[PDB]
Amino acid sequence: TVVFVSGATGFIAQQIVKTVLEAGYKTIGSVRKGKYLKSLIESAGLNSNLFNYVIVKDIGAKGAFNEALQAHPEVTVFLHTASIHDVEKELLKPAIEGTINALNAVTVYGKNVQRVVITSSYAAVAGFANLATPGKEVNEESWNPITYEQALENPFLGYIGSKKLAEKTVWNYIEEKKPKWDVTFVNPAFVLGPQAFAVRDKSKLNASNEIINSLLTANKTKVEPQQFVGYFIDVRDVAKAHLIAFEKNETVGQRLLLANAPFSSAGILDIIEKDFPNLKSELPKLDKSKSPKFEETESVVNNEKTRRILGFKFIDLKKSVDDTIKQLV
Numbered sequence: 001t002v003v004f005v006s007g008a009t010g011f012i013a014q015q016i017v018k019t020v021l022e023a024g025y026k027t028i029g030s031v032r033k034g035k036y037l038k039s040l041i042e043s044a045g046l047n048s049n050l051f052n053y054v055i056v057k058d059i060g061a062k063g064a065f066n067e068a069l070q071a072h073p074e075v076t077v078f079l080h081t082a083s084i085h086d087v088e089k090e091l092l093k094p095a096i097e098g099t100i101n102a103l104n105a106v107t108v109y110g111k112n113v114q115r116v117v118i119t120s121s122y123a124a125v126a127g128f129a130n131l132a133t134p135g136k137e138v139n140e141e142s143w144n145p146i147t148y149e150q151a152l153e154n155p156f157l158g159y160i161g162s163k164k165l166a167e168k169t170v171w172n173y174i175e176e177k178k179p180k181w182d183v184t185f186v187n188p189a190f191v192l193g194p195q196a197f198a199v200r201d202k203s204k205l206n207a208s209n210e211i212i213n214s215l216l217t218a219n220k221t222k223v224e225p226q227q228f229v230g231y232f233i234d235v236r237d238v239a240k241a242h243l244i245a246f247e248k249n250e251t252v253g254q255r256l257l258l259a260n261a262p263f264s265s266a267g268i269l270d271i272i273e274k275d276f277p278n279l280k281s282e283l284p285k286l287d288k289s290k291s292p293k294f295e296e297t298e299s300v301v302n303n304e305k306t307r308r309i310l311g312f313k314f315i316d317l318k319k320s321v322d323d324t325i326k327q328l329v
């Protein structure tokens with residue numbers, strides 16, 4: 001098998017590129033640095049003859065992957081991973097077009113592709129903010145009731161909208177165009193965990209791991225840490241689920257809800273104080289009033305279907321946080 005991965009230099013994608021190579025599959029990643037990632041795998045001890053790369057400056061531009069799928073027609077898996085606070089220019093339309101630019105380039109040029117795995121999100125599963133359904137039931141088939149108009153009112157709700165709607169463009173495409181490849185959706189919740197190989201900037205991680213990292217850099221930046229609630233998932237569990245999304249035949253047309261257990265910025269902090277006492281002078285005191293309560297925004301995730309299909313045991317929060325902190329010293 002030959003697995004293509006868009007935006008390979010990303011947080012989840014680097015873990016995706018890693019666990020695939022550990023399964024012996026070939027890999028071909030996209031890059032905006034190609035030697036930054038190839039020097040990373042070989043030095044990591046991985047079996048390093050299963051990876052090359054392509055250069056793609058932008059995903060939201062038309063035909064972004066055509067010359068990538070016209071230089072290598074051998075690919076048979078497409079892992080579309082590349083897709084918070086922005087600048088408030090435009091976040092919705094490039095997110096839906098960036099996906100469409102790939103569904104138009106995988107169909108028009110990549111015909112050796114059989115399975116496509118679109119990395120979506122839990123934001124396309126349950127509602128946020130004014131559409132919060134606290135205490136209510138959500139599962140693989142549930143959908144965020146947010147609309148395009150109700151989105152991009154916030155860099156937060158806009159990201160929530162841009163992720164719920166970009167998955168819709170795949171659902172509309174597979175029926176409007178009726179392609180020859182099969183689709184699978186991996187819907188990761190709040191992804192935590194350590195980098196695939198090596199951290200590059202210890203002061204700022206990805207937007208998701210800053211949930212952990214802000215607790216460390218708070219006393220340096222003198223920034224009161226923004227607290228969060230919701231469901232977490234370890235980046236290694238998401239990486240393993242992306243393989244099952246194309247290696248297994250029962251994941252076809254399934255929205256793999258990649259959520260473990262609830263979490264909280266306060267709950268994550270307690271793990272760091274116990275397992276890393278040398279940091280007790282670097283960890284802050286969280287305000288009990290600034291803390292969002294769980295039973296108020298988040299629904300009840302019913303991913304019983306996904307856990308049964310994945311079949312493996314996920315990484316607990318303690319191991320996820322411990323492995324995360326171990327990298328940043």
Ligand SMILES: NC(=O)C1=CN([C@@H]2O[C@H](COP(=O)(O)OP(=O)(O)OC[C@H]3O[C@@H](n4cnc5c(N)ncnc54)[C@H](OP(=O)(O)O)[C@@H]3O)[C@@H](O)[C@H]2O)C=CC1
Binds near residue numbers: 008
């Ligand atoms: N907690 C989480 O991590 C969550 C993850 N997800 C989804 O999973 C995916 C992985 O995100 P994650 O790894 O955590 O975050 P990162 O920011 O680390 O990943 C971003 C990736 O997308 C690429 N990219 C972004 N914008 C562009 C662009 N305009 N043109 C080309 N490439 C671009 C980046 O390439 P480069 O870095 O080289 O610029 C990078 O590889 C995302 O699509 C995210 O929405 C879903 C829900 C939550």
